[PDB]
Coordinates of C-alpha atoms and ligand atoms in Angstrom, one line a residue:
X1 CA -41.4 -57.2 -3.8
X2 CA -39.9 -55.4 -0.5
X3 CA -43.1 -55.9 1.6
X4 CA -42.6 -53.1 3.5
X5 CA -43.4 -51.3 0.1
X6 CA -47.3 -50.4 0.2
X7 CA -49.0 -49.7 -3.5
X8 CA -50.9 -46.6 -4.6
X9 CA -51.0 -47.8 -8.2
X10 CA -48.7 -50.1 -10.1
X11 CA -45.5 -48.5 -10.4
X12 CA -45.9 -46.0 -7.3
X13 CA -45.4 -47.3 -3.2
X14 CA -45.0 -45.5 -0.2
X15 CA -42.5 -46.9 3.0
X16 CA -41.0 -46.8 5.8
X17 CA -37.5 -45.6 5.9
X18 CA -35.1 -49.5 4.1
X19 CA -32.2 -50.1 6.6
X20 CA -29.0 -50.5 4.6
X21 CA -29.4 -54.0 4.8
X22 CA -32.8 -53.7 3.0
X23 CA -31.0 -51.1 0.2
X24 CA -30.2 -54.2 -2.3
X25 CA -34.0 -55.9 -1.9
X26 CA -35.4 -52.1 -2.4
X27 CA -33.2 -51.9 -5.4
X28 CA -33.8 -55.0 -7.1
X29 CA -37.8 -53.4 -6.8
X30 CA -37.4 -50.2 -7.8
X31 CA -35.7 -47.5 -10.1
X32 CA -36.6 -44.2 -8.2
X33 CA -36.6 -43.3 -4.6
X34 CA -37.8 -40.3 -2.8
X35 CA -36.3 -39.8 -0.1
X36 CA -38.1 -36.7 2.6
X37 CA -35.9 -37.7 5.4
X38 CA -34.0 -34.6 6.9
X39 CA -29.7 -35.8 6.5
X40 CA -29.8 -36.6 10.3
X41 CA -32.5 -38.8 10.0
X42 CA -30.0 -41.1 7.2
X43 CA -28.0 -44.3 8.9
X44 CA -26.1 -44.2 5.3
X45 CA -25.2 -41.8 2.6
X46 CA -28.0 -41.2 -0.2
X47 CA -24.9 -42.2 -2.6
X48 CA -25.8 -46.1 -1.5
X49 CA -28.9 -45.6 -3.8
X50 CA -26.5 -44.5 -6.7
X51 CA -24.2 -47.1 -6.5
X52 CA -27.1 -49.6 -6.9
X53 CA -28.2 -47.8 -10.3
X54 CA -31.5 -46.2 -8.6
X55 CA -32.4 -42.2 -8.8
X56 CA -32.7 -40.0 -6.0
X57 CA -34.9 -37.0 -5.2
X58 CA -33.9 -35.9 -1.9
X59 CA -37.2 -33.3 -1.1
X60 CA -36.3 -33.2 3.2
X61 CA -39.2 -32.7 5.3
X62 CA -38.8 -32.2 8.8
X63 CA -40.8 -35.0 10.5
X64 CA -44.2 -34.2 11.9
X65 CA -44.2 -31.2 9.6
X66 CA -45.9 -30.8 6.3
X67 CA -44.7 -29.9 3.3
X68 CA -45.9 -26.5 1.3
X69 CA -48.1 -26.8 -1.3
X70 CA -44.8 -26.2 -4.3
X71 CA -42.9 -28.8 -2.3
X72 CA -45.5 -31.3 -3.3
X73 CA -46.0 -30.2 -6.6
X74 CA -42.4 -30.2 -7.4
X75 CA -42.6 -33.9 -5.8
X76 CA -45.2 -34.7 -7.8
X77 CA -43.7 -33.9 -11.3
X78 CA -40.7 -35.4 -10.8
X79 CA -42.3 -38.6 -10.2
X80 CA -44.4 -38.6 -13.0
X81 CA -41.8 -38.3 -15.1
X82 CA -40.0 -41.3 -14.0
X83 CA -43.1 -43.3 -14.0
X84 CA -43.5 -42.3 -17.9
X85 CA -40.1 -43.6 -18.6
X86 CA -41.2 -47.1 -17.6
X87 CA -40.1 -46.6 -13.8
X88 CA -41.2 -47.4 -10.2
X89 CA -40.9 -45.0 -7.7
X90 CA -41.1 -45.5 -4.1
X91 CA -41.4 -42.4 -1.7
X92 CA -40.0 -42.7 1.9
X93 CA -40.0 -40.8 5.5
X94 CA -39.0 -42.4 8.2
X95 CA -42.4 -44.4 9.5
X96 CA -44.2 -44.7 6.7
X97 CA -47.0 -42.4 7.8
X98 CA -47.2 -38.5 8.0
X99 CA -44.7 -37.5 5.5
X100 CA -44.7 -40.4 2.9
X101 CA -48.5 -41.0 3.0
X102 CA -49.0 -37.4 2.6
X103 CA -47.2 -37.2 -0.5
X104 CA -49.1 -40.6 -1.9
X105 CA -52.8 -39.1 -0.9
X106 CA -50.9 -36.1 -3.5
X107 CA -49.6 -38.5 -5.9
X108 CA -53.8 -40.4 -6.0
X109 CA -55.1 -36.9 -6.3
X110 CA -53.0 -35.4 -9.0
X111 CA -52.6 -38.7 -11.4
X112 CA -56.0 -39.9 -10.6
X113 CA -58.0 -36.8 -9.9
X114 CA -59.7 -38.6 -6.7
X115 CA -61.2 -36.6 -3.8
X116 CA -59.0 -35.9 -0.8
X117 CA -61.3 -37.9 1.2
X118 CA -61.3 -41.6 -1.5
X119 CA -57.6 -40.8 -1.7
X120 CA -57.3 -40.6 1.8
X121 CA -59.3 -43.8 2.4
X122 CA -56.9 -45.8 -0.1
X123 CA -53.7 -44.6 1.4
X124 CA -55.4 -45.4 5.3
X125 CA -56.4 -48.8 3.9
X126 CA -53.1 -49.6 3.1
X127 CA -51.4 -48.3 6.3
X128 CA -54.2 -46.7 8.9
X129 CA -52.2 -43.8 10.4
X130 CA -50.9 -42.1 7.3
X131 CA -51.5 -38.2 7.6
X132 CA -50.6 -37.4 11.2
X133 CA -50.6 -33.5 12.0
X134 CA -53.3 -31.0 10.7
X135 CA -50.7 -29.5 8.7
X136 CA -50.6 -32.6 6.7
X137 CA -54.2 -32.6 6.1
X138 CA -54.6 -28.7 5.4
X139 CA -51.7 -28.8 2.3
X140 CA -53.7 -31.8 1.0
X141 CA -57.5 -29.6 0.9
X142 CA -54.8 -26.7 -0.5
X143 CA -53.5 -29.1 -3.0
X144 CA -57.0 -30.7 -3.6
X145 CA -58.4 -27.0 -4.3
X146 CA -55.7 -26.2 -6.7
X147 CA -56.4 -29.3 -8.5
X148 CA -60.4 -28.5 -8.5
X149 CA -59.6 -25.1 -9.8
X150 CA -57.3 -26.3 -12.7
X151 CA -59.5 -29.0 -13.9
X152 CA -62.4 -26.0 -13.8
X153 CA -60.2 -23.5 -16.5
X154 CA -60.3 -26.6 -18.7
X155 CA -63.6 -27.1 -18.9
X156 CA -64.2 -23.4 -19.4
Ligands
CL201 CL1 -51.7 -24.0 -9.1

């Protein structure tokens, strides 16, 4: 297991950005990548993935910004649906803080229905720092809200 690869649940990490050098490792680990790097950010083409058999969703995020609250949701789905074919998915920016811890505090809340706050406290366990900007933060209470609200039409 890449240890640069930090677990959310059993088949879902977050990371830093692999160096092409660490593309074969990360491979070897896992099926799906999502990558939220903007192209510039890339020292190799997204193809490199391909060529060693693993699936790509490219979902760029400019860094120290925050996705919208779609963005994550569409993020969200895709990776449940890899990790329901037997798959693990890791999700990527390029420190492993802001952008790919935001999306795992997303990916706790939605597949584990967890508060903003416990999944926030799991993802900060795991690497303190994750979450950086208060545009991070306020998509996550959005997000968290929208998941309160749908779990309330079910019950009623
Ligand atoms: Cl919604």
């Amino acid at each position: 297991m890449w240890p640069s690869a930090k677990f959310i649940d059993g088949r879902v990490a977050f990371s830093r950005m692999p160096a092409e050098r660490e593309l074969d490792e990360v491979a070897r680990d896992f099926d799906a990548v999502v990558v939220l790097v903007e192209d510039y950010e890339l020292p190799y083409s997204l193809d490199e993935w391909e060529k060693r058999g693993v699936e790509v969703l490219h979902g760029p995020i400019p860094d120290f910004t925050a996705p919208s609250v779609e963005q994550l949701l569409e993020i969200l789905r895709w990776i449940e649906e890899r990790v329901r074919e037997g798959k693990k998915v890791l999700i990527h920016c390029m420190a492993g803080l802001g952008r790919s811890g935001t999306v795992g505090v997303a990916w706790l809340m939605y597949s584990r229905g967890l508060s903003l706050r416990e999944a926030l406290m799991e993802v900060r366990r795991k690497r303190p720092g994750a979450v950086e900007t208060q545009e991070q933060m306020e998509v996550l209470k959005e997000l968290e809200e929208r998941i309160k609200l749908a779990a309330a039409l079910e019950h009623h």
